[PDB]
Symmetry: C2
Subunit: 166 residues, 2 copies
């Protein structure tokens, strides 16, 4: 399901739900002391050692290897649908989900965010802090999280189509 | 401000806001492949090398060094106060903030969560993956994040007292 097109179709099926933006999950290499806000490199696919080595060769003073699961933003009509949606999200791995604002047209703006993630410093203060054996395990871990975090998005989309209140 | 007692007093001053639970931010060593849900060790203070070494000696197959900024749960009376509160949270470093549910008494249940964090594997598949120079930098980083993440909570509490709508 490239781009999660099938998942998004299911999520958009309900008349009271409309997705405005989505991210299927990604692996990024972020430069700087803080990774929570830029992006030296990003990919929505499992990352290779070569891709990581290319960024390490760029000589950033501080570099993070970060993987984040899917995150969705929706416009929902009514609290009854939003309620069922948030409960569904939390059951499928999106622990971090809630209403963030209310649009001028009164629709609820909801954010569905995956609980799966990893934010690991690869380089700190100009010093690479991960040896080769470690880097391979971290790369394998980032890829595992990326792939597995999408499963919950799929099951969630399955659940959403069934939400009667929506 | 031990325990953030002053911060909590300010946040609870408004008649339309009541905190039900809070965490001033913490550093934890979590066992297992997933760190997002247990806790091998936790501390709300900067961590020492000795504290970390004690857990490493326990021989966990998988171990994460995790630091999370402050997180608050509040019961808020009305969307006008909740709106001003969420906007205030986001301005002070709590990017992850929203209404998660609505209590039976109709008050809004809000979650304010810090954007600062780090989740780094220390041991994976029985193998310690961080050398000594690296561990010291990671420990220093975890402590920096813990301390700095509390600043936003303080400024936020300052802002909250001023929220007219609350």
């Amino acid at each position: 399901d490239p781009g999660a097109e099938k998942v998004l179709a299911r999520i958009n099926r309900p008349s009271k739900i409309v997705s405005t933006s989505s991210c299927t999950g990604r692996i990024t290499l972020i430069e700087g002391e803080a990774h929570w806000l830029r992006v030296a490199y990003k990919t929505h696919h499992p990352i290779s050692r070569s891709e990581v080595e290319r960024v390490l060769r760029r000589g950033f003073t501080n570099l993070w290897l970060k993987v984040t699961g899917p995150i969705l933003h929706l416009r929902v009509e009514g609290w009854q649908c939003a309620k069922s949606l948030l409960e569904a999200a939390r059951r499928n791995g999106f622990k971090h989900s809630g209403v963030i604002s209310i649009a001028e047209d009164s629709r609820l703006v909801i954010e569905i965010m995956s609980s799966q993630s990893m934010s690991v410093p690869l380089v700190m203060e100009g010093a690479r802090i991960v040896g080769d054996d470690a880097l391979d395990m971290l790369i394998e871990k980032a890829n595992t999280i990326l792939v597995e975090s999408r499963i919950g998005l799929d099951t969630f989309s399955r659940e959403v189509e069934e939400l009667v209140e929506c």
